[PDB]
């Protein structure tokens, strides 16, 4: 009854076991300073995505080589991590997936990519520009600062053609 | 009564090593004791061992090289599924790289690594690390 019931849903964040650890409160604030994050949930999501990927890597490393699952599932984890750019292209092994940080999840995010391309003066600048849809990846405008681009789309990231090139010519304050 | 022949043997070897005794004697000799010790001799943890014949259960004079750290038995011998071997190695042995778990298999008494290569599992006789 109601196909809505059959639609799935999941939690994408994992709160810390201890919430008031001073070393782990300060480090999260630094990781909000360099990445322009609104709330700690965004860092928790980053650790949930990394932990799952690391758990796949650890359950495959324990498995013997030439066991078919290690060859197939491991190649699919590596390919995904290479396509996103989380895994450096040169490493090409399962062990290097275990030795990764949430810095690699954050770097692929669009807000950090715009600063690297020098389009954004800061990460705080980029967040506002993406909310104002001034950024297009591969010809598609994005409004999400956690879009996370793939290595191929890195070059195709550009200022939205219809936004800051002034095709409108009367944008916001200029109009009036 | 003497329910486990192997437990008394590996205890009498560990006690001898702690004293620093080079050679020890095991009062009852079994075929499974010889197979467990043979595995330790092919792993370098033991030295030459000689089964004297008393015309009864037989004795074993075991030579040691200080190399063995711990030798024990899992009782009752629980049959281990192939995918369960690693879970046993993560608790019973220190380090995934060193140690040995000796399991009786249909192929024969073998270490966990040999069983993993043949992709079969079996009842655990004991462990030597």
């Amino acid at each position: 009854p109601r196909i809505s019931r059959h639609r799935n849903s999941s939690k994408t964040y994992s709160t810390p076991k201890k919430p008031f650890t001073k070393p782990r409160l300060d480090a999260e604030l630094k990781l909000c300073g360099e990445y322009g994050l609104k709330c700690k949930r965004e860092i928790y999501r980053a650790r949930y995505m990394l932990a799952k990927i690391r758990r796949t890597a650890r359950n495959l490393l324990t498995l013997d080589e030439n066991d078919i699952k290690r060859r197939f599932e491991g190649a699919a984890l590596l390919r995904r991590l290479h396509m996103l750019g989380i895994l450096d292209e040169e490493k090409d092994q399962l062990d290097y997936v275990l030795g990764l940080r949430i810095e690699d999840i954050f770097k692929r995010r669009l807000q950090s990519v715009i600063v690297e391309s020098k389009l954004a003066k800061s990460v705080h600048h980029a967040r506002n520009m993406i909310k104002a849809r001034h950024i297009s990846v591969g010809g598609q405008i994005v409004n999400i600062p956690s879009y996370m681009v793939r290595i191929s789309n890195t070059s195709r990231v550009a200022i939205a053609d219809t936004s800051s090139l002034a095709p409108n010519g009367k944008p916001g304050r200029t109009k009036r | 009564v003497r329910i486990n022949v192997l437990r008394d043997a590996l205890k009498s070897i560990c006690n001898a090593q702690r004293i620093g005794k080079k050679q020890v004697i095991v009062r009852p000799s079994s075929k499974v004791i010889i197979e467990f010790l043979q595995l330790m001799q092919k792993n370098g943890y033991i030295s030459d061992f000689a089964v004297v014949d008393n015309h009864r259960s037989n004795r074993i004079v075991v030579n040691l090289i200080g190399r063995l750290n711990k030798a024990g038995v899992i009782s009752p011998r629980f049959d281990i599924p192939a995918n369960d071997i690693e879970k046993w190695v993560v608790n019973l042995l220190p380090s995934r790289l060193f140690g040995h778990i000796i399991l009786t298999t249909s192929q024969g008494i073998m270490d966990h690594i040999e069983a993993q290569h043949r992709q079969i599992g079996g009842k655990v006789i004991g462990y030597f690390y």
Partner: protein, 62 residues
């Protein structure tokens, strides 16, 4: 006893709230918390790091 109830609450003289400016919200507030705590090294620094509500940090910032 029950008749003398809430005696400190009635006794307390009503105190007026300061009309402070609206604070930055969301990412901007996080930026200011990061700025004060790690960057600058002036607001919480007496030549050494100090606690946010420290009496030395107060008076210096008012």
């Amino acid at each position: 006893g029950l008749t003398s109830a809430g005696k400190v609450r009635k006794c307390t003289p009503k105190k007026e709230k300061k009309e402070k400016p609206r604070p930055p919200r969301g990412r901007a507030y996080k930026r200011l918390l990061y700025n004060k705590n790690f960057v600058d090294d002036t607001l919480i620094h007496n030549g050494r790091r100090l606690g946010p509500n420290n009496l030395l940090i107060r008076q210096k910032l008012g």
